[PDB]
Design a protein around this ligand. Sequence first.
Ligand SMILES: [Mg+2]
Ligand SMILES: [Zn+2]
Ligand SMILES: [Zn+2]
Ligand SMILES: [Zn+2]
Lengths: 51, 123, 79, 61, 56
Amino acid sequence: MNYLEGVGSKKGGGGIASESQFNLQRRKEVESLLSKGENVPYTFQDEQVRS
Amino acid sequence: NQPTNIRTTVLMDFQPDVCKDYKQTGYCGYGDSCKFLHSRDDFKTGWKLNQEWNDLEKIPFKCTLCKEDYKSPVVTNCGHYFCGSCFAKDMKKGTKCFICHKETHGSAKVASDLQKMLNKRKS
Amino acid sequence: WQSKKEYLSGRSLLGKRPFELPDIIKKTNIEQMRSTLPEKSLKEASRARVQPKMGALDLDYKKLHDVFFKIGANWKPDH
Amino acid sequence: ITSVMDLDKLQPPINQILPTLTPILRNKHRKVEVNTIKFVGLIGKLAPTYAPPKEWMRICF
Amino acid sequence: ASGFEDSMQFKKLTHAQRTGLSQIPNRRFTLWWSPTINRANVYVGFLVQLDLTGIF
Ligand SMILES: [Mg+2]
Ligand SMILES: [Zn+2]
Ligand SMILES: [Zn+2]
Ligand SMILES: [Zn+2]
């Protein structure tokens, strides 16, 4: 009857992920904010007007 | 004091409580809270290690040249077997086995052990 | 020397192209299997560590060996 | 005991040992991580064929 | 159990992992009292046998 508690889990895989993985995620979003979402193109891509 | 005259049928419990995520993976989301066993068993040496990165009869009875019975049989440095006429003729063209293509050097033993195993009496 | 520029400075280096595999190696088909130029939710990645999935590259071992040895034995760079 | 004794005659046996270690690799500390990684790599040398290859990939992660 | 709880892990625990209660002490309590909590004399109840054991 441990249903009394109210926590749970989904049955998929192994949750938390690895601190290194969080930084990669966080440093992409920070460069998305400050960039105001623009896609700054690569130098080789053969030129969507840039800001 | 369970009553004297009763037969109670055993009802098997076939459900194991094994936690299916911890049995497969070895990680269970729920943790120490999990309502089930967590016991972790694995199968039985199924796999065979072959690396791509890196009463058998091996004696044909009829020839590979005559396609006929071995007569005046011949042994090479392999387990190759031919007629005296067979092996002499192959060297007129081929350098090597008619089979391996390893170096025979024309080297041929009298193969009497063949006639033995081609006897019904062996030796 | 006598250049305060530090030897390598930009004006030519701005436009240098990323890298091109030698043609013999490009025959091995790796170019297609892993596309480097130029995706996975963090939850779906952590699910991959636990599952995991096998045979990602589908590379052929006999082909790889020959490129360096049998076919590309004498392959030497152009200039 | 494992390196000293023959594998085939190990009592637990091996195929039952190795899946018990993989959740121990998550044990942090050191004495456990060191002594385990030496045990797991032992089996990689001596008896690779027991755990199925998706188990070896669970260890590589 | 007062000994080692602190160093389990830190950041890593999933919600259930961290908050939920461990079933492990209750299992200890029902192993120690098992032969009363499981006894055949019962008023109403049905026999089952576990899969590979002889435990009713
Ligand atoms: Mg739920
Ligand atoms: Zn579980
Ligand atoms: Zn012949
Ligand atoms: Zn041969």
